[PDB]
UniProtKB/Swiss-Prot annotation, chain B:
Described function: Gel-forming glycoprotein of gastric and respiratory tract epithelia that protects the mucosa from infection and chemical damage by binding to inhaled microorganisms and particles that are subsequently removed by the mucociliary system. Interacts with H.pylori in the gastric epithelium, Barrett's esophagus as well as in gastric metaplasia of the duodenum (GMD).
Location(s), subcellular: Secreted
Range covered out of full length: 126 to 222 of 5654
Protein name stated in the entry: Mucin-5AC
Gene: MUC5AC
Tissue: Highly expressed in surface mucosal cells of respiratory tract and stomach epithelia. Overexpressed in a number of carcinomas. Also expressed in Barrett's esophagus epithelium and in the proximal duodenum.
Note on domains (UniProt): The cysteine residues in the Cys-rich subdomain repeats are not involved in disulfide bonding.
Sugar attachment sites: 77
Length: 97, 94
């Protein structure tokens, strides 16, 4: 279809739409063994914000910035409201969505 | 109160038009007629204020305090309000 499927023998599957979208399928053999921006796979969604330092935080920005590969990379800041910074698009967006 | 018309509020594809006696506001900003923007044309004549929307509507606020709306036939069976559901049958569905 519109998807490119990367299949692995370890139980991990990837679907990529050749664009910003990516879907990662994990077998139930990796529960509690994974980490990163995708959570830790232990059926609990509130502790998925665990940082690289192994601490669950309430700030999404801090949890996301803790997972950057390069420590020298600048931290991400809070973005503006897309429909407030660009109101002239807002109507179209709604009419499109 | 005479049964005068005080305010007419129009939402036309993201454009907000407020018509009051001696005032026309577009998106909260007073405008000078004729005013064309985003496919909406507002113009004042000796007897009426006309708002034409290219999506297919015409609104007339006359000086005898009459508000007349004319709609494109593509909106039939898809409207609601004091003007009915626009399906060609007077009583049913209203
Ligand atoms: Ca979890």
């Amino acid at each position: 279809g519109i998807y490119l499927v990367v299949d692995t023998d370890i139980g991990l599957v990837l679907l990529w739409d050749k664009k910003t979208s990516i879907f990662i399928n994990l077998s139930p053999e990796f529960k509690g063994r994974v980490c990163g921006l995708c959570g830790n796979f232990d059926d609990i969604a509130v502790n998925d914000f665990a940082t690289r330092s192994r601490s669950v935080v309430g700030d999404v920005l801090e949890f996301g910035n803790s997972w950057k590969l390069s420590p020298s990379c600048p931290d991400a800041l809070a973005p503006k409201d897309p429909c407030t910074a660009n109101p002239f698009r807002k109507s179209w967006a709604q009419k499109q969505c | 109160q005479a049964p005068t018309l005080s305010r007419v509020l129009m939402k036309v594809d993201g454009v907000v038009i407020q018509l009051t006696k001696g005032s026309v506001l577009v998106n909260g900003h007073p405008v000078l007629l004729p005013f064309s923007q985003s496919g909406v044309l507002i113009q004042q004549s000796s007897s009426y204020t006309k708002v034409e929307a290219r999506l297919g509507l015409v609104l007339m606020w006359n000086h005898d305090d009459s508000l007349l709306l004319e709609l494109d036939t593509k909106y039939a069976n898809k409207t609601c309000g004091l003007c009915g559901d626009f399906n060609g049958m007077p009583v049913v569905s209203e």
